[PDB]
Design a protein around this nucleic acid. Structure first.
Ligand SMILES: [Mn+2]
Ligand SMILES: [Mn+2]
Ligand SMILES: [Mn+2]
Ligand SMILES: [Mn+2]
Ligand SMILES: [Mn+2]
Ligand SMILES: [Mn+2]
Ligand code: NA
Length: 326
DNA sequence: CGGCATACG
DNA sequence: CGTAT
DNA sequence: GCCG
């Protein structure tokens, strides 16, 4: 029987039920736009279950016994198997609410709450937002100005170039400091919508104060189109053939003692980390975050030298990043 | 029925 | 409120 | 929306 938590099963990047999972993820997204985090989670988990199957679902009976498939998600699959389309999914796709909330929430600096308020105010398009910039944060003005570039997929070739320039700035800010690619690209994705880096130093404590020094140096190189500590959400100026494009880059610093936990957290997927933390607390009674793993009975933190250590601590079989695509 | 991950800027 | 996996 |  397939386990109920996504951290208990390998989930590869590409799989055998793409259309089915994409349909359920539409309904998950729509649930989020309406504030129903519980329904979002169920649809997300049901989608991830299908991503973990070893072959295509061809018949409804193949759902029997799969975790997170009840009446609703089963009916969605049933209709896709019978008619190739699910009326509910298509109604969501076409709805003005879904399209506008998707458009607005995809803006850097705009969340569900902001998008929803704007929708209730009658706003529908990006130019509607541009007409009244007085009500925008600096972060939202940056997200809107750069929205077109930020909607273009980042390519792995872009990533290698960004990593070079980040290492140069890190190397000047603190000799010996290291840069690790995380996020979706570490899980094997060939494209993404941003690039994530994790920075540390092998001498505990030397990483303190590092991120301001890195940012100051990137800014002096003329590479920072926007930025706001240990997490920096930037927009980088990435060279292009005879030009350049804006790219979202996340820079994160962790002391080496916490590096395994921060690597694990920032490598994702988002659902995988939520499931891993849920598993940790509910099944093992341990509290997991990107800083460490806490035993609340003994009041002690687990020491980890690797991701492998963390999986072992939790009684889980190790999963490489490429199998964490829940 | 209560829970649904857990942080930082 | 936003951001991150 | 689903699980325990
Ligand atoms: Mn239903
Ligand atoms: Mn039918
Ligand atoms: Mn990312
Ligand atoms: Mn990111
Ligand atoms: Mn910290
Ligand atoms: Mn309830
Ligand atoms: Na957003």
């Amino acid at each position: 029987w397939m386990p109920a938590y996504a951290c208990q099963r390998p989930t590869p990047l590409t799989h055998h039920n793409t259309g089915l999972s994409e349909a359920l993820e539409i309904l998950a997204e729509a649930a989020g736009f309406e504030g129903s985090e519980g329904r979002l989670l169920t649809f997300c988990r049901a989608a991830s279950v299908l991503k973990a199957l070893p072959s295509p679902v061809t018949t409804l009976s193949q759902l029997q016994g799969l975790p997170h498939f009840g009446e609703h998600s089963s009916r969605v699959v049933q209709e896709l198997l019978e008619h190739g389309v699910c009326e509910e999914v298509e109604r969501v796709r076409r709805s003005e609410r879904y399209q506008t909330m998707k458009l607005f929430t995809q803006i850097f600096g705009v969340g569900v709450k902001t998008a929803d308020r704007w929708y209730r105010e009658g706003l529908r398009t990006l130019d509607d937002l541009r007409e009244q910039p007085q009500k925008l944060t600096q972060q939202q003005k940056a997200g809107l100005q750069h929205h077109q570039d930020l909607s273009t997929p980042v390519l792995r070739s872009d990533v290698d170039a960004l990593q070079q320039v980040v290492e140069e700035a890190v190397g000047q800010a603190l000799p010996g400091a290291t840069v690790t690619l995380t996020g979706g690209f570490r899980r094997g994705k060939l494209q993404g919508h941003d690039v994530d880096f994790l920075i540390t130093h092998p001498k505990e404590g030397q990483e303190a104060g590092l991120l301001p020094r890195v940012m100051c140096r990137l800014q002096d190189q003329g590479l920072i189109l926007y930025h706001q500590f240990e997490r920096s959400f930037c927009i980088f100026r990435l060279p292009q053939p005879g030009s350049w494009k804006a790219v979202r880059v996340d820079l994160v610093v962790a002391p080496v003692s916490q590096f395994p936990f921060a690597l694990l957290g920032w490598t994702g997927s988002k659902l995988f980390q939520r499931e891993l933390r849920r598993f940790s607390r509910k099944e093992k009674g341990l509290w997991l975050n990107s800083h460490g793993l806490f035993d609340p009975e003994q009041k002690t933190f687990f020491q980890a030298a690797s991701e492998e250590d963390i999986f072992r601590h939790l009684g889980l079989e190790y999963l490489p990043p490429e199998q964490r695509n829940a």
